[PDB]
Amino acid sequence: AEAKVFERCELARTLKRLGMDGYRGISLANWMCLAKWESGYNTRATNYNAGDRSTDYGTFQINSRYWCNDGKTPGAVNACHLSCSALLQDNIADAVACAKRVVRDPQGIRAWVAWRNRCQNRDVRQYVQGCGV
Ligand code: NA
Ligand code: NA
Ligand code: NA
């Protein structure tokens, strides 16, 4: 869909408001670094994985095969109990709640490869600097 992209500090603030800072021991800077490499802060971001017909959705690019139902991913399991479309709305409440569910599993935030490659073990302070959070 046409993009609906937050501004770095507005998302930082919203995520903070929604209880993301420190959630599961994950700092806001880390959630910001994730959203950045994942969707570029684009809440409408979708990405089709031709390998298993799955698609990644919204800000956190959550996968339809395990987390949200998109009604088009064969053999999917809906762990968040949400429609993937719910993860593509300007209001990121449902999205944040699913992201929380995702990092509650054993691998936490390491479930996202991009986070592992871009954010993990690296200085991420740049992501929240200036935001007043
Ligand atoms: Na602005
Ligand atoms: Na502006
Ligand atoms: Na605001």
CATH of the domain at 131: 1.10.530.10
**Experimental resolution (Å):** 2.4
Per DSSP, which regions of the chain are E strands?
Answer: 46-49, 54-57, 62-63
Domain boundaries, position 110: 1-133
Query: Count of domains in the chain?
Result: 1
Determine the distance separating the centroid of ligand 3 and the alpha carbon of 91, expressed in angstroms. Answer: 12
Determine the distance separating the centroid of ligand 1 and the alpha carbon of 68, expressed in angstroms. Answer: 31
Q: What's the CA gap between 34 and 11, in Å, rounded? A: 12
3-class state of residue 57 by DSSP: strand
- 21 is known as an active-site residue: no
State the burial class of residue 25 (Cβ atoms within 10 Å of its Cβ: 0-12, 13-18, 19+).
exposed
- 2 is known as an active-site residue: no
For the CA of 12, the nearest ligand: 3
Please name which of 5, 8, 64, 54 lies closest in space to residue 31, comparing C-alpha atoms.
8
Q: What's the CA gap between 126 and 52, in Å, rounded? A: 35
Enumerate the H helices of the chain as residue ranges.
Answer: 8-17, 28-39, 93-102, 113-118
* Catalytic entry in 21, 38, 70, 94: 38
